Structure formats: structure tokens, C-alpha cells
Amino acid sequence: METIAKHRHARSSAQKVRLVADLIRGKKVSQALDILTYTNKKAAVLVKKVLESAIANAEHNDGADIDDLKVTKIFVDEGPSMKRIMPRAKGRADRILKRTSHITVVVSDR
Amino acid sequence: AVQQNKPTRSKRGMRRSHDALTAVTSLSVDKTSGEKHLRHHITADGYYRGRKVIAK
């Protein structure tokens, strides 16, 4: 492949991280860090190790170098809704989903 | 305090319309390689003139 580097669960929602990794896409690879390392919150750090991966992973599987690359595809898919139960008052329902999300990010070239 | 039909996917994002973060517009500092927050100076060691914390 043109080097990949997924996560797997990691725990933190679909929409929550579909956010962050929208800034990444198009340009990037060098811009990888800069625009994560600053842009705040949590979702946007569980990308800044799947990018350091998807780079060393292009210095192994792929012989490509740390300045090229592109980041031609990212998407966050819906990981298993990790379920449990909450109290409340009387009890009724506490669906409470601890929701999760796989990561996959891919860098290649022009 | 409840709806009656189901707020379709179509509308799913017609709130979501606005969010899709925006990121930066950063600059460097005369002394770090290309770091610098938008207001705090050299991350690279930490300073602006000189002895900000522990430097050179």
C-alpha cells in the first residue's frame, strides 16, 4: 500500500474526531504536526501519533521520506458502541454509549 | 418538550453546518526554527529576549 497507519477503537466518538482530522487532508505531512500540535482539545492528539506512525510506516513498508508524502485520505469510522448502565432517578433508561472510533490515515504523493 | 417526527439525516447536519473547526496562521520568532505559539515565543527552549525560565 501507499503506507497506512490505523488506530482501532482508541475510544472517543465518531463526530468528535471526524472534526479534528478534517483540518488534516489535502496539504500536510509536514503540516501534519503543526496544525495538530496547536489546534486544541483531545480528539486532536489521537491523530498526532497515527501520523507519526503513518510516517515511520513510510520508512519501512515504503522507502519514502519524511518531507514528501501528502495525506491523501483520512476518515473516521464508527467503532463498537461500548455500552454500560447509569443510575438516574427511579432508574428508567440509561442507554449510555461509550462510543468508539477507528482511525486509518494515509499519506502518499502528488 | 418533544418532537413528533424524525429529524432526518438531511437535517442531521443542517445544525452541523457550522463547526468544522478552523486551525491556525502561525509564526516563528527570530530564534526558534519555526515554532512560537501565536503569542508565546521560543518553545524550542523557552524565551524571547534571553533568560525566560532557563535558556542561554
Binding site: 509536514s30 504536526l33 519524511i66 518531507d67 | 526554527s33 519555526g34
Partner: peptide, 16 residues
């Protein structure tokens, strides 16, 4: 060392 190959180096050996 090109400021990303630097962000590497400086750390890949703040390991060794």
C-alpha cells in the same frame, strides 16, 4: 536536517 527531519532527530535520540 529539514525542520521535520529535525523534529525527528532531536527526539529519536532524546531516546538513545
Amino acid at each position: 536536517a529539514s525542520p521535520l527531519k529535525q523534529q525527528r532527530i532531536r527526539q529519536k535520540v532524546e531516546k538513545l
